[PDB]
Amino acid sequence: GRHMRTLLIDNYDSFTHNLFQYIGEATGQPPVVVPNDADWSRLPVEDFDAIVVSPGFGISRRAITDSGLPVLGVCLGHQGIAQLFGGTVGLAPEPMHGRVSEVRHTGEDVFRGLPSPFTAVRYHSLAATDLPDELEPLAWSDDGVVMGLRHREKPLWGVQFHPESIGSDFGREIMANFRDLALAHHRARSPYELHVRRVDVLPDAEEVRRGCLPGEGTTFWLDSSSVLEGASRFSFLGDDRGPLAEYLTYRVADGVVSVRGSDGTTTRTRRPFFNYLEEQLERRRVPVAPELPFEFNLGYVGYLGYELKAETTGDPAHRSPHPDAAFLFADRAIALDHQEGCCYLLALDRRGHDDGARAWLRETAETLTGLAVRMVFGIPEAAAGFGPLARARHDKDAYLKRIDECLKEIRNGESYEICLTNMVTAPTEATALPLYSALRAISPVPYGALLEFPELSVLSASPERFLTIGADGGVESKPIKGTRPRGGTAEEDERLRADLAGREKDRAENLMIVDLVRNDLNSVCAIGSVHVPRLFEVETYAPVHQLVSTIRGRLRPGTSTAACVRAAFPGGSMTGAPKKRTMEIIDRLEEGPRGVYSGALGWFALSGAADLSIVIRTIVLADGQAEFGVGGAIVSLSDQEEEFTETVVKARAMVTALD
Amino acid sequence: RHMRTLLIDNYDSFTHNLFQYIGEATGQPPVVVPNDADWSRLPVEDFDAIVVSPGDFGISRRAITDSGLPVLGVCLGGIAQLFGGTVGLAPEPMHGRVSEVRHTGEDVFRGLPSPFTAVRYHSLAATDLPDELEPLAWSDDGVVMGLRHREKPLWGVQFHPESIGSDFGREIMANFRDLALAHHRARRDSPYELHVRRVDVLPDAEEVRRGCLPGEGTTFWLDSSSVLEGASRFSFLGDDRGPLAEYLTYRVADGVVSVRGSDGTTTRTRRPFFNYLEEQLERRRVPVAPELPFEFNLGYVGYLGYELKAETTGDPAHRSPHPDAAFLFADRAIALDHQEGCCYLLALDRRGHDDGARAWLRETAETLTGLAVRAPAGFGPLARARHDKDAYLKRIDECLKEIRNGESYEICLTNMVTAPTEATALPLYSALRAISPVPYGALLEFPELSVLSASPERFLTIGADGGVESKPIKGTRPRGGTAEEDERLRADLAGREKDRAENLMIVDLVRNDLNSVCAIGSVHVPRLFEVETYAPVHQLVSTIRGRLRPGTSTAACVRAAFPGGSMTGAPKKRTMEIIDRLEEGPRGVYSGALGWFALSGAADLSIVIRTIVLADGQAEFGVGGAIVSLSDQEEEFTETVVKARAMVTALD
Ligand SMILES: N[C@@H](Cc1c[nH]c2ccccc12)C(=O)O
Ligand SMILES: N[C@@H](Cc1c[nH]c2ccccc12)C(=O)O
Ligand SMILES: [Cl-]
Ligand SMILES: [Mg+2]
Ligand SMILES: [Mg+2]
Ligand SMILES: [Mg+2]
C-alpha cells in the first residue's frame, strides 16, 4: 500500500535527533523534523499519520488539540497533554536529570509487551500531579510519579521519561507500539444498520444447525467443535433466507463473479475475485459493535479455492470442477459464545428500511431458548488405505514418482520445500449433515465448518489458522508443517509428540514455511511489525500431532483485508518455498486441480476483520461422491515411502467418517 | 542526505524479509527491482548500494561486474562464479537448517559473536576461491559462509541473514550499509603528490622537537606522552619552513580568515571558518597511503577556540584575546610510531613538480637516525582566578537556580586562571608532560600564543572511511596517596549516581550531535562509565560511535558537535547562553578542540582541558566541572582546584 509518515516536532531541546534515530529504526522510515515555531496553516499536516512531540506555544499545541492525528508526547510533550486538558503540572518529589527509575505499568498501548518494571531515564523537575477526567495514567516510577498517560477517547499518549536515552530500555519497542497505535487509528477512520440481541442460553451447536437453519437451502456452520481458552471460543451459523442475503460464486476460467441476489437475480461480471471482494467490503463497511466479544459483525462466509492462485502469484494451470470461490453474504447470523455460555443474534436492515431484522431477532431468540437442554488413529492402522470405494488421482507408485520428481527439483535448486498433494474420490450416498455430524465427533478442531451450497457441501475438520485479521489491522498466521501420526498406545504417543518437537527435519520443514509466510506478510505489513512470537509449538488433534508456528504483522495504511489475503494466498503451508516456482512444479506433477482443498475457508466481516482456516482434513460432497485432499512437505531429507504413508495417515478422519 | 539501497528481486520468497531487515537496520526501505529490469533504463548512478536477493539473471550479473557500487550477494548473489571461483556440491544439502558460523569479525561480520547461528538454503558452495576473493566465514561442516573481493566493494554471505532461525541479520545489513558509506567517501583532481619514507629508528620525541624543529619558528608537537595499546600510539612534529606550508588564523568578530604563505605575504577572506576549512579540505583532497598505519596524511594542525560556537549553535557573547582558530597547513611532518619503534616522514610536492619533498625526506631521515643514536626513546602563589571562591560559589548557585527552572540539566561551569611566568614554552611543556603523561598531549608554538595541552580527552576521531568516535569525559576524582586509596576512588567514581548522571547526560547530548550528521542506526555506545586513570585524576569516560551520512564533510561533523557536549552540557544552546552570562568572558583555546584535519578526510581532535596558554609572559589555564541538581557548591569549587594541580605543579 504505502509506508506510514511520522511528523517529529522539534521543541529545540538536545534530544530530537536521538528520537529521529529511534523512530527510523523502529518504523523503517525517518520522520519529517519540523521546528515548533513553524507556520501550522502552511504545514502539510494532511500528509502525516502520526506526530511525535519532542521535549523542550507553537505547533505542539495545535498537533494535540487540532490535528486529530495520533500524538506521542515525550516528557515536556507528556506534560503538554496533562496541562492542555486542565491538569496540574507541579514539582515532582525529587528533581531527576539523567537519572534512572524503575517504571511499573499495565502493559497497555505504548507499554505493550514491555516487562514491568523496566528501566527509564528521566529529565524533568515537573510531573502530572492531578490528572483530568479525560486522561488516565498507564505507568508510575518507583518514586510514585506518573510515567505514562493517555486520553480516554483521542489518540494521545504521553511518557514522562526519555525512551531514546542510553540508560532507558525498550525505547524502540515504545516507538514501534506508537506506530501500531497510529495504524490502528487510521484503519478505524454505511448502507446498513446492525441489530444485536444477546440470549443467555447456549444450546448444543448441532441442535442450533438442525433447529434454526433449513435442511434444504444454502447454509453455513463455522464449528468450534474443539473449544479451548485462547485457541477457539465462538461458532457462527446462518442461511440465505434473509432479504439482504446473497450467494456469490467465481470461475477463474471465465474470470466472472456470479452473484445470486435476495431478489432472485444472478448478476455476472468478468473481473478477479479478490478485487471484487475488496470493492464490496469497502462499499458495505459497518463498524464493530462494542457489546460483541468477537469481530464478525456479519459479512461473507465461504471459501477461496486453490485455483484462485491464477490471480495471485500462480498460473491458471488447471480448472476446478467446483466454484473457485463461493460465499454467502450473511445478512443474518447466530453466534455461539462457548466461553460465556450465551448466544448473539446479528441482523442487517438497510439504513432506511425495517427489512424485518428486529422480527428475525425476537423469533430466532424464542427458537434458541427451546433448543437449550443437557478418537485416536495410530500407525499402521491409520495408514491402511483411502477406503474400499476410494480412488486416489495418483496410486502409491504414481505418488512415489512425483515425490522422486520433487527430490530432483530440490537437488537442482528449483525448490527448498514442495507441498506435494493427492486428491482422493469415493462414491457415497451420505448427505452433508449426517456425514459432518460423524466427522466433528471423530476430529474436534478449532476451525471446523459445514458449508451447504447449491453446487457442493464442504465438510472441514481443519485445525489450521491461515489468517486472523483484526478490524485494527493486526494479522496472525499459524502455519502447520511437520506431522507425526498418533500412537496405538499412550506411551508411543507421548514419544512421537516429543520426536515431532525435537527432530531437525520437521523443524526445517516448518521454519521454511515461517520464512515464506513472513515474506508474504512483509509485502503488505508495516516495516518492523512482522515477528514470530512462537516457533515449533506442538498441537495434538484426534488423528495427528502437528508442528505449529505463530507469525504476526500489522497492515500498512491503504492495504485492505482482501489485499492481505491475496498477498498470502495460497497459504505458504500448502505450497512451499519459493512459492511461484513451487506452484509451477505442483502444476506439472499433480496433473489436476486441488479445488476447495488447500484453499482458505472462513469469514470477512463488514468491520474489515477476517478469520480464515487452511482447507485440510476436508470432504467436498458433490454429485454422489466425496473428494478429499491429503499431502505433506517434500524436502531433501524426505524418504519416499514415509512421505506417502503420511498422506494416507492424514486421510484417516475422512475415511473413518465415510466408513 | 540518506543512503539509497537497490534490492534486486531474483524472483524468490525472501525479498520482503530482506526489505524488512534493511528498513529496520538502516532506517530507510530499499527500492525493490526485479532481476529482468532494463539495465540501460535503470538509474544505477542514483543508488549507493546493491543487495542481490537469493533465487538467466541479467541485472544481478551487471550489478556485480558492470556497476562499481558496493554489492552484498545473499546466497545465490554469483560473486564466486563471476570472478573465476568454483561452485561445487556441499557435503550436505542445507535447506531451512541452522549452522554455527565462525568468522574473522571483518566487514559484514563486524561485532558479531563467533560462532553465531545462521540458516542455510543451498546445496552448492564456493570451494576454490581465486586470489581476488577472500573467505571471511565458515560453517561447522567446513563450507565457506562469507567472502569479499580483495579490491572491489563486493561481499557474499552463503546463508540468509533475514531467516527467523538466523541471529544478527539486522547487524549484517547495517555493517553492509557502513561499508557502502566507507566506499563512496573514499571515491570523492589532487593538487599535491604525497611522498612517504619509513625510517626504522625511534628517537626520544622531546629530542626530535629540540633537534628537527626550529626554536623561534611556528611549530606543532602532537605528543602521545602516554602510549597504551588501542588508546595512543603516534606523535606528529612539524614547522612552517616548507615551501607549501601555510599559517592560518580566524577572528569571529571580523569573520576573517588570515592565511600566511611560504612567501611571507598574508591573504584575508571573509567566510565562516568551517565553510573555509570544508572548502580547502575538498580542494586539497589526497587519498591515504596504505603503508601508513595512521590516518594523518598531512593537512591542518591546530585548535578551534570555544568562541567559534558563534558559527555553530552559540552566540558571540565574548571576544577571545587569542585567534578563534589557528592552524599550520603542514606540507612536511615527522610521525613517531611508538608501538613499532620506527618513524614515518611525510612531504607534499605540487602535482607533477619537485618542491624538494624527496630531499627533505632523505635529509630528515639522516637527522632522525643520528638523533636516535644520541637519544633513543591551590591555584598558585601569584595566580589570579577571574572569579574568586566567593564569586564562583554564587555562580554555582545561579547554575542550580537555572537547573531548578528546568533551563538546563547540566552546566559545565568553568573558571579562567592567569599568572605571570618567566618560563618559556618548551621547558614548561617538558615539565607538564613528565607531570601528566596523556594520549592527547600537545605543544603548539604559534606567533600569537603557545598551547601546552595535557588533555586526555578524545572529542572526535573521524576515519577517512567516515567512522566517527567521541569519548566524552565527565566524572572526576583526585588520585589517592596509595594503591588502595586509588582502588577506593576508582570504585567510588564508577558507582556514584551523581557521576553516572553527569556522564549519561553528556552521552545523550553527544549521541544527539552525532545523530544530526550520522546514518540512522549507526550511532551506538560500545562503552558506558569506564574509569581511566591519569597522573592527576581518575576520569569517568563513555565511548560513542557513528557513521557519517553521504554528503556530510568531516568539517560539517565537527561543526555539528562543537563545542564538545562534555564542556557545555544539555541542552547545549540554552546551557551555552547561561555560561555566557555567568563566566563574564571568553574561554579562548580552553574548552575548544585541538588536533589535525587530514587531506584524506580523516581528523583527530582532543578537548582542550588541563592546558596552559602562554602569551605576553602570562600563563592562562581553564578549570571547571559539571553542575547538576545534586551538586554541592563547596565540593564543585574544590574539584576545579583538584583539576588545576598538573598546570600549577608545571608552572611551579
Ligand atoms: N474457531 C473460530 C470460529 C470458527 C469455527 N470454524 C471456523 C472456520 C473458519 C473460520 C472461523 C471459524 C472462533 O473461535 O472464533
Ligand atoms: N594520540 C594520537 C596522536 C596525538 C597526540 N596528541 C594529540 C593531540 C591532538 C590530536 C592527536 C594527538 C595518536 O596516537 O594517534
Ligand atoms: Cl524478526
Ligand atoms: Mg537500554
Ligand atoms: Mg514431510
Ligand atoms: Mg534470531
Side-chain angles (χ1 to χ4, degrees), chain A residues 97-341:
Chain A
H97 312 299
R99 291 166 62 188
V100 124
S101 278
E102 293 308 291
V103 178
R104 282 171 176 78
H105 62 87
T106 72
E108 290 180 308
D109 294 351
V110 297
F111 295 99
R112 279 205 287 251
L114 273 67
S116 190
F118 75 95
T119 302
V121 179
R122 292 159 56 182
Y123 280 92
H124 67 261
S125 308
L126 299 169
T129 308
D130 248 327
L131 277 179
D133 305 327
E134 314 106 55
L135 301 200
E136 82 174 281
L138 294 175
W140 307 261
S141 61
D142 45 27
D143 214 7
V145 174
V146 168
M147 283 293 112
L149 64 76
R150 76 184 165 195
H151 201 287
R152 287 194 205 285
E153 304 292 77
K154 302 156 90 98
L156 304 172
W157 295 274
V159 295
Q160 270 267 213
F161 58 87
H162 283 242
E164 85 296 349
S165 175
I166 191 53
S168 299
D169 291 338
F170 309 104
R172 291 164 179 82
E173 282 79 5
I174 287 161
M175 304 309 298
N177 284 333
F178 175 59
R179 187 272 306 285
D180 295 348
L181 282 163
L183 290 178
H185 181 252
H186 291 302
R187 293 204 86 83
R189 277 271 148 83
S190 178
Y192 307 120
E193 194 186 324
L194 175 66
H195 301 278
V196 180
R197 200 258 178 91
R198 191 168 160 270
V199 203
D200 286 314
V201 303
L202 181 67
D204 181 280
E206 196 174 316
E207 202 63 64
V208 173
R209 163 60 187 74
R210 289 175 181 276
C212 290
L213 310 195
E216 220 246 82
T218 310
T219 71
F220 66 93
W221 178 12
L222 302 194
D223 177 21
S224 290
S225 45
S226 167
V227 174
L228 194 88
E229 191 172 306
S232 54
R233 178 175 167 186
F234 305 106
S235 295
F236 304 99
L237 300 95
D239 59 47
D240 67 354
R241 288 185 292 190
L244 302 182
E246 293 175 9
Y247 180 61
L248 311 93
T249 54
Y250 189 70
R251 301 294 178 172
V252 163
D254 300 327
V256 301
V257 190
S258 307
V259 47
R260 185 265 287 155
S262 188
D263 295 55
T265 60
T266 40
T267 283
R268 218 181 129 267
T269 320
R270 189 182 192 281
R271 70 193 288 175
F273 187 71
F274 280 110
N275 172 260
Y276 170 82
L277 189 63
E278 177 173 66
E279 182 239 337
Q280 294 293 76
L281 287 165
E282 189 172 316
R283 201 215 76 177
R284 293 156 184 256
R285 275 213 314 235
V286 182
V288 63
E291 68 264 36
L292 291 188
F294 52 81
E295 270 189 11
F296 181 66
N297 63 342
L298 298 172
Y300 295 87
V301 183
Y303 76 78
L304 305 158
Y306 188 65
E307 282 61 50
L308 280 187
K309 69 191 174 79
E311 76 174 50
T312 74
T313 52
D315 295 327
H318 308 285
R319 171 158 318 106
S320 180
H322 311 294
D324 296 297
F327 283 92
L328 188 64
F329 180 71
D331 64 331
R332 293 178 179 172
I334 306 163
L336 306 194
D337 186 346
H338 298 285
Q339 179 187 298
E340 291 310 318

Side-chain angles (χ1 to χ4, degrees), chain A residues 38-39 94 196 223 244 414-415 582 598:
Chain A
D39 185 9
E94 219 253 309
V196 180
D223 177 21
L244 302 182
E414 292 288 300
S415 189
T582 304
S598 186

Side-chain angles (χ1 to χ4, degrees), chain B residues 281 285-286 295-300 596-604:
Chain B
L281 287 167
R285 186 79 150 189
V286 181
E295 300 223 52
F296 181 65
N297 72 326
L298 297 180
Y300 298 86
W596 54 259
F597 294 88
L599 302 180
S600 74
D604 201 355

Side-chain angles (χ1 to χ4, degrees), chain A residues 242-491:
Chain A
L244 302 182
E246 293 175 9
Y247 180 61
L248 311 93
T249 54
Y250 189 70
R251 301 294 178 172
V252 163
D254 300 327
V256 301
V257 190
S258 307
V259 47
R260 185 265 287 155
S262 188
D263 295 55
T265 60
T266 40
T267 283
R268 218 181 129 267
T269 320
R270 189 182 192 281
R271 70 193 288 175
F273 187 71
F274 280 110
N275 172 260
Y276 170 82
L277 189 63
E278 177 173 66
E279 182 239 337
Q280 294 293 76
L281 287 165
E282 189 172 316
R283 201 215 76 177
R284 293 156 184 256
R285 275 213 314 235
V286 182
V288 63
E291 68 264 36
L292 291 188
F294 52 81
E295 270 189 11
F296 181 66
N297 63 342
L298 298 172
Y300 295 87
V301 183
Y303 76 78
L304 305 158
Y306 188 65
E307 282 61 50
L308 280 187
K309 69 191 174 79
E311 76 174 50
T312 74
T313 52
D315 295 327
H318 308 285
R319 171 158 318 106
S320 180
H322 311 294
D324 296 297
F327 283 92
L328 188 64
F329 180 71
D331 64 331
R332 293 178 179 172
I334 306 163
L336 306 194
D337 186 346
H338 298 285
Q339 179 187 298
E340 291 310 318
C342 63
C343 296
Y344 293 92
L345 305 177
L346 312 188
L348 294 179
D349 285 318
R350 294 198 217 101
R351 55 180 135 205
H353 293 95
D354 180 55
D355 294 310
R358 290 208 221 267
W360 182 83
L361 260 43
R362 103 97 179 93
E363 165 145 285
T364 306
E366 207 172 338
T367 298
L368 278 171
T369 60
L371 300 178
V373 287
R374 213 52 247 183
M375 224 274 287
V376 170
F377 263 117
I379 264 189
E381 293 95 325
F386 287 128
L389 300 171
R391 173 257 177 187
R393 188 183 297 157
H394 316 285
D395 64 40
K396 178 158 195 204
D397 271 296
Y399 204 73
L400 294 179
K401 268 45 127 210
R402 274 71 171 163
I403 295 166
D404 279 343
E405 283 297 316
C406 290
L407 290 169
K408 299 305 184 309
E409 294 285 7
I410 290 167
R411 222 175 303 133
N412 290 338
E414 292 288 300
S415 189
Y416 308 118
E417 175 182 331
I418 303 163
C419 192
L420 180 70
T421 76
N422 211 340
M423 180 58 60
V424 182
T425 303
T428 184
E429 289 141 313
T431 56
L433 179 55
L435 183 55
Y436 184 73
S437 181
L439 184 61
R440 72 189 297 275
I442 287 162
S443 192
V445 286
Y447 281 102
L450 175 57
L451 306 181
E452 295 166 89
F453 293 173
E455 308 86 353
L456 75 164
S457 291
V458 182
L459 283 66
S460 179
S462 177
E464 185 160 10
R465 165 175 297 148
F466 171 36
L467 288 171
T468 305
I469 304 172
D472 74 334
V475 180
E476 183 175 290
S477 184
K478 293 185 73 186
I480 295 176
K481 217 78 195 180
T483 309
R484 205 67 86 247
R486 297 298 298 273
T489 54
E491 279 191 20

Side-chain angles (χ1 to χ4, degrees), chain A residues 518 528 530-532, chain B residues 20-21 24 162-164 170:
Chain A
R518 281 174 68 240
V530 171
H531 68 291
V532 183
Chain B
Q20 171 182 13
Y21 276 43
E24 291 192 46
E162 86 298 343
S163 179
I164 191 61
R170 290 171 180 80

Side-chain angles (χ1 to χ4, degrees), chain A residues 3 12-22 24-31 55-56 91 94-100 121 123-125 162 164-167 172 410-411 413 415-416 504 507-509 511-520 522-523 526-532 535 556 576-581 635-637, chain B residues 2 11-21 23-29 54-55 75 89 92-98 119 121-124 160 162-165 170 403-404 406 408-410 497 500-502 504-513 515-516 518 520-525 528 549 570-573 628-630:
Chain A
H3 305 300
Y12 292 100
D13 210 319
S14 57
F15 302 110
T16 304
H17 284 107
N18 291 345
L19 282 167
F20 178 87
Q21 169 182 12
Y22 272 47
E25 286 195 46
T27 67
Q29 280 275 243
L91 291 160
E94 219 253 309
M96 293 283 280
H97 312 299
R99 291 166 62 188
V100 124
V121 179
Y123 280 92
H124 67 261
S125 308
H162 283 242
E164 85 296 349
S165 175
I166 191 53
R172 291 164 179 82
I410 290 167
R411 222 175 303 133
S415 189
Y416 308 118
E504 168 164 19
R507 290 162 76 90
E509 286 180 6
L511 186 147
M512 293 190 276
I513 301 316
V514 171
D515 281 345
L516 179 56
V517 173
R518 281 174 68 240
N519 195 66
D520 286 351
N522 264 317
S523 73
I527 302 172
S529 82
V530 171
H531 68 291
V532 183
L535 205 57
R556 301 172 188 191
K579 200 190 294 196
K580 188 174 186 59
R581 190 63 260 267
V635 294
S636 58
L637 288 165
Chain B
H2 301 292
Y11 289 145
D12 210 317
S13 296
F14 305 111
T15 300
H16 291 99
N17 295 344
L18 279 171
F19 179 94
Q20 171 182 13
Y21 276 43
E24 291 192 46
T26 70
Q28 262 276 354
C75 211
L89 199 65
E92 191 173 16
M94 292 283 280
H95 307 127
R97 293 162 63 189
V98 293
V119 169
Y121 285 88
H122 62 90
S123 303
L124 268 44
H160 286 244
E162 86 298 343
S163 179
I164 191 61
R170 290 171 180 80
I403 293 163
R404 197 186 328 292
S408 188
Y409 312 116
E410 182 181 339
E497 195 188 347
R500 290 171 78 93
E502 284 182 10
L504 184 145
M505 288 191 273
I506 305 316
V507 167
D508 275 350
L509 178 55
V510 169
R511 281 172 66 235
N512 194 70
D513 285 353
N515 267 313
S516 70
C518 285
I520 296 167
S522 79
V523 173
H524 67 293
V525 179
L528 197 58
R549 299 179 188 175
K572 194 189 285 177
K573 188 165 176 67
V628 288
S629 67
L630 295 172

